[PDB]
Amino acid sequence: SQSIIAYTMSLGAENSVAYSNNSIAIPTNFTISVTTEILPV
Amino acid sequence: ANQFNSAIGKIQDSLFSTASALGKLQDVVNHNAQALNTLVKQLSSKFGAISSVLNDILSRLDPPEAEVQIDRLITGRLQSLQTYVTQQLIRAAEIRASANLAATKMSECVLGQSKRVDFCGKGYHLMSFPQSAPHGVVFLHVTYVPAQEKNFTTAPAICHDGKAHFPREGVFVSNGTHWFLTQRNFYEPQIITTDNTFVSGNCDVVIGIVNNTVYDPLQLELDSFKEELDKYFKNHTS
Amino acid sequence: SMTKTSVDCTMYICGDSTECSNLLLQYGSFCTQLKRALTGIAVEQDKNTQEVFAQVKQIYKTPPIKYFGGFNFSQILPDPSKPSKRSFIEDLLFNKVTQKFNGLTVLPPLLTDEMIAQYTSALLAGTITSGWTFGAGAALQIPFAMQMAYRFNGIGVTQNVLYENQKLIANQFNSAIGKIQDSLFSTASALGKLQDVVNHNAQALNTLVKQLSSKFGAISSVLNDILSRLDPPEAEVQIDRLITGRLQSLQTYVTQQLIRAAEIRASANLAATKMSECVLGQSKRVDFCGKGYHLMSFPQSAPHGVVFLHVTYV
Amino acid sequence: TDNTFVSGNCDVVIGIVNNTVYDPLQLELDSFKEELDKYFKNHTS
Lengths: 41, 238, 314, 45
Ligand SMILES: *[C@@H]1O[C@H](CO[C@@H]2O[C@@H](C)[C@@H](O)[C@@H](O)[C@@H]2O)[C@@H](O[C@@H]2O[C@H](CO)[C@@H](O)[C@H](O)[C@H]2NC(C)=O)[C@H](O)[C@H]1NC(C)=O
Ligand SMILES: *[C@@H]1O[C@H](CO[C@@H]2O[C@@H](C)[C@@H](O)[C@@H](O)[C@@H]2O)[C@@H](O[C@@H]2O[C@H](CO)[C@@H](O)[C@H](O)[C@H]2NC(C)=O)[C@H](O)[C@H]1NC(C)=O
Ligand SMILES: *[C@@H]1O[C@H](CO)[C@@H](O[C@@H]2O[C@H](CO)[C@@H](O)[C@H](O)[C@H]2NC(C)=O)[C@H](O)[C@H]1NC(C)=O
Ligand SMILES: *[C@@H]1O[C@H](CO)[C@@H](O[C@@H]2O[C@H](CO)[C@@H](O)[C@H](O)[C@H]2NC(C)=O)[C@H](O)[C@H]1NC(C)=O
Ligand SMILES: *[C@@H]1O[C@H](CO)[C@@H](O[C@@H]2O[C@H](CO)[C@@H](O)[C@H](O)[C@H]2NC(C)=O)[C@H](O)[C@H]1NC(C)=O
Ligand SMILES: *[C@@H]1O[C@H](CO)[C@@H](O)[C@H](O)[C@H]1NC(C)=O
Ligand SMILES: *[C@@H]1O[C@H](CO)[C@@H](O)[C@H](O)[C@H]1NC(C)=O
Hints:
Chain A: This is Spike protein S2. Chain A: It comes from Severe acute respiratory syndrome coronavirus 2 (2019-nCoV). This is part of a larger assembly, with 4 copies of chain A. Chain A has strands at 23-27, 30-40. By secondary structure, chain A is mainly β. Helix content of chain A is 0%, strand content 39%. Strand 2 of chain A pairs antiparallel with strand 2 of chain B, so a sheet runs across the interface. The structure holds a molecule of 3 linked components (NAG-NAG-FUC) (2 copies), a molecule of 2 linked components (NAG-NAG) (3 copies) and 2-acetamido-2-deoxy-beta-D-glucopyranose (NAG) (2 copies).
C-alpha cells in the first residue's frame, strides 16, 4: 500500500573518521571515474 | 584502460535514465517557450477596452472615439513587451555567466590539467572531453579516485644517527615491524634510504620522531669493497 | 541566499473585492508571470544553499578528544551544550545578524539552520581529520602535524620548517583564531553584506506593501470606499487606476527581486567555488583564499551566507 | 641513474626498450678497482 510520507531530510550516512594520533591511511588501489557536467551555453 | 572503457560505457546509461543532469538545457528551452507563449497570449486581453482585436474596434467606432480603445490596447501591449524584454535580458545575463563558466571549464579542463579542486570533477582531475548538446555543452571529466585504503602507523621523521631524516617525497609508514617510505596517493613502499630523505637538525626537536635505520647505499658499497681489500691485505701479509 | 517570498495577486491588489478581482481578469496573465518568477527565485535560493554547503557525501565527525597537534579548534568545533550544534563563532554570527497581512507570505528555507550547522561541522571535521583527501573520494585520516607539513610543502616550504617550529606555529594559530571574535563585529568592514541582504529584503517588502496607501490619481486608496460611494460604471475608472498602480508596484518589486536574485546567485556560485577550493583543498590561486600563501580554510555558517576563516602563511 | 628511478622488471611495461643506463659510481669504482688490480699484479710480478 504505497502512500505519501513526509520525513526529515538526511544529510548523509553518519561516518566518524578514525583519526588516530600517529596513524595515516594510504590507498592501495584506485578507480577511474568519468563524471558529467552540463552547462547551458 | 579497462576501467576507463567501462566508465565510458556507463556514460550512456547514467545520463538519460537517472534524470538529475540534462535538465538545465531543457529548462532553458522550456523557459524560452513559456515566455514566448505568455507574450503571444497577451494579444487576447482587453486591458479595459471593448475588444482584443484592433480590426473590430476600428470597424465599430469612429476615429475620435476609437483613439481611446486603441490607446488602452497600446498601453497593455507595450507593458507586456517591456516585461518580456526585461525577463529576456535577465535570462541572457544568467546564460552569459554560464557560458563564461563553460568556456573557462573548456580551457582549463579540456585544454589542460586542472589543480582546482572540484572544478573539473569530483576527484583528482585527469582530463575532460567535450560534447555538444542543444543549446549547451557537456563535459566528461575523467577523474582519479583512490578506492582501497589500508591504514598504517606513521611518523614525521626518522632519527637514525642522531639526525632527523624527513621524507623527500611521500610519508613514512610501518606495517608493524619495519618502516618504509611510500608515495602519498598509492601504497608503493620503498626502503628508507638517504636518496629519498634529507637531514635537518637532530632528533630532539621533532615531535613523534621514530627510531629506525636509514640505509646508505654508498656506505654499503664502500664497506663491501673495504672488506675485500682488507682480506686481500691480510692474505698478502700472511 | 536571500529571503524567499511569495505573492498573491488578487489578495494584494483587489483583496476581498469580487468586482475588483473581475476587473483584474482583463489583464490576462499579467501576474502568473510574477508568481512563476518568484517561485523560480525561491527554488534558486534553495539550490544555492544546497550547492554551497552540501559538498560531502558523508557527515564526518571529530574524535571525542580534541587534540590536533597543538592547534586549538575549540572556537569552531560544535558545542554540544546548545539547543543547536553551533560553534562559538557560528553562534556569535547568528546573534549579531538580526507585511504578511496583504498577500505577502515568506517561505522558509529548505535547509534548517541546524542542518547548515551540521554540514559545516562535517566539512570542518573532514578538513581537520582527513586533510584534503575527503574532497577527492574516501576520507583518509592523517595526523594534523603531517597535514600541516603537507600544506607547508605545498607552498614551497620544506616540512622540517614546520616540524622544527610546531610549537610556535601552533601558538600563532591559536592566537590568530583568538582575535577573530574581536576583528569581526567591532571593526565594521565585513559582516555588512548579510545585514545588507536582510535589510534590502525587509525594505523591499515594506515598500511594496506601503503602496497600498497611495491613490495613483483615484479618489481614495481604499477599495471599499470607492465601491460604496460610487456607482459601478463610474467607479470602474478609479478601480482600473488603482489596479494599474498596484500592478506597477508588484512588477517593480518582482524585477528588483530578480536582479538581486541574480546578484546573490553570483555570490553563491563564488561561495561554492571558495568552499570547494579553499576548504576541500589547498589553493595555489593568489589572493583567492586570503592575503598570503593559502594554507587551509574553515567554513562557518552565518545567516544568509557563509564565513571563511582563511589561514595563510606570510 | 640520477635522473631515472627503477620500478620492477621489464616484463610489465608496453613499449619498453633496451639501452644502457650509465652509472657514475659504478664506473668510478670499476676504474679504481682496475687500477688497484693492475698495481697488485705489478707488485706480485
Ligand atoms: C632512539 O635511539 C637513540 C639512540 O640509541 C642508540 O641506538 C638505539 C637503536 C639503541 O641501540 C641504543 O642502545 C643506542 O644507544 C636513543 O638515545 C638513547 O636514549 C637512551 C634513553 O634515554 C639513553 O640511555 C642512551 O644513552 C641514548 N643513546 C644515545 C646514542 O644517545 C633514543 O632515546 C631512542 N628514542 C626513543 C624514542 O626511544
Ligand atoms: C630487451 O632485452 C631483453 C633481454 O635481452 C638480454 O639483455 C640484453 C641487454 C642483451 O644482452 C640481450 O642479448 C639479452 O638476451 C630482450 O629479451 C630477449 O629476447 C630475445 C629474443 O626473443 C630472447 O632470445 C632472450 O632470451 C630475451 N632475454 C631475456 C632476458 O628474456 C628483449 O627482447 C629486448 N627488447 C627488445 C624490444 O628487443
Ligand atoms: C598524541 O600524541 C602526543 C605525543 O605525540 C600526546 O601528547 C601528550 O601526551 C601525554 C601522554 O603521553 C598527555 O598526558 C598530554 O596531555 C599530551 N599533550 C597535550 C598537549 O595534550 C597525546 O596524548 C597523544 N595521544 C592522544 C590520545 O592525543
Ligand atoms: C584494483 O581494483 C581493480 C578493479 O576493481 C582490480 O581488478 C580486478 O581484479 C579481480 C581479481 O583478479 C578481477 O576479477 C576483476 O575482473 C578485476 N577488475 C577489472 C576491472 O579488471 C584489481 O585487482 C585491484 N588491484 C589491487 C592491487 O588490489
Ligand atoms: C582553546 O580555546 C578555548 C577558548 O578560548 C580555551 O578555553 C579557555 O580557557 C581559559 C583558561 O582556562 C579560560 O579562562 C576560558 O574561559 C576558556 N574559554 C572557554 C570559551 O571555555 C582553551 O583553553 C584553549 N585550549 C588550548 C589548549 O589552548
Ligand atoms: C583504520 O584503523 C582502525 C583501527 O584499527 C580501523 O577501525 C579502521 O577500519 C581502519 N581503516 C580501514 C579503512 O580499514
Ligand atoms: C611487514 O612488511 C615486511 C616487508 O614486506 C615483512 O617482512 C613483514 O613480515 C611485515 N610484517 C607484518 C607484521 O606483516
